[PDB]
């Protein structure tokens, strides 16, 4: 997915429900999360991670750190993870608690990411 075009070109909603079913069966200690760049301002690079499988005991601040580094964003470059469309950039919480709080209709969690929370 990181070398191809935008995530929907790889996998659709019902096929992401199949991903949740397979991952919950094989590795239930990891949490199913989707990640996508903000459509209103595509300022950040096309380093399309698309999804991640986070261990239960990883902090949201630690997830932010690995994802900021994988997106090549140095300390001077602005960056935010928007859980279900809203920022949690300052929070220390374990990913499972953030998950059960913001888990969507079919068992996945969403994170939109951006250089600023809104622009247009």
């Amino acid at each position: 997915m990181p070398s191809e075009k935008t995530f929907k070109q790889r996998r659709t909603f019902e096929q992401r429900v199949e991903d949740v079913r397979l991952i919950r069966e094989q590795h239930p200690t990891k949490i199913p999360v989707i990640i996508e760049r903000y459509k209103g301002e595509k300022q950040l690079p096309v380093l399309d991670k698309t999804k991640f499988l986070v261990p239960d005991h990883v902090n949201m601040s630690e997830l932010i750190k690995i994802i900021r580094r994988r997106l090549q964003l140095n300390a001077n470059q602005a960056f935010f993870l928007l859980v279900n469309g809203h920022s949690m950039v300052s929070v220390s919480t374990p990913i499972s608690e953030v998950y059960e709080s913001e888990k969507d209709e079919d068992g996945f969690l969403y994170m939109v990411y951006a250089s600023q929370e809104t622009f247009g």
């Binding site: 997915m1 790889r10 991670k49 999804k51 991640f52 499988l53 986070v54 261990p55 690995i66």
Partner: peptide, 17 residues
Amino acid sequence: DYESDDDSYEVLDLTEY
């Protein structure tokens, strides 16, 4: 490495502790 694609994948591309 594997990161984001299919099935048996290590999508966070790290060994947890």
